[PDB]
Design a protein around this nucleic acid. Sequence first.
DNA 1: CGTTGCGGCAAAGTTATGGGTAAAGTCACACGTAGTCACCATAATGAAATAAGATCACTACTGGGCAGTACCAGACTCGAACTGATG
Length: 69
Amino acid sequence: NRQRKLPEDTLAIMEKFILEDYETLKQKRMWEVHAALVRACEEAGVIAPSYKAFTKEVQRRTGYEQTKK
DNA sequence: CGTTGCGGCAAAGTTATGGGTAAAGTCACACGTAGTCACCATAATGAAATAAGATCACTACTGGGCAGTACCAGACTCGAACTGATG
């Protein structure tokens, strides 16, 4: 079952937050960025992904680009 | 007719994949990361020096005029004397 179980708006928001609040010149930890994402999701009325989902997708962005950013 | 092998049908069984939730791990807080030669071109004087220029001193060459001399008359001026009118 490769179908994504999260709603599309939840994806888009979490993509945006991983892009613009984690890979940034601050070296923020994953817990704080997840908390900010959850706060934004609760403002937007969408489903907030769990912390394990955040860590797993962050683990999908590893390599050169993230280490450089 | 009965038996036997074969094949369709539809649960049922097995892997796989992307989610959530408690719970075992993981690791930094322990004063500390910035810090230091090496590098060769450009401005930038200040000195070193210029290359020509400026003036002195001497040597030789060549224009060339001034104080003084001299004659041949022409012409005005006037001693000295002559001579005529006169009161």
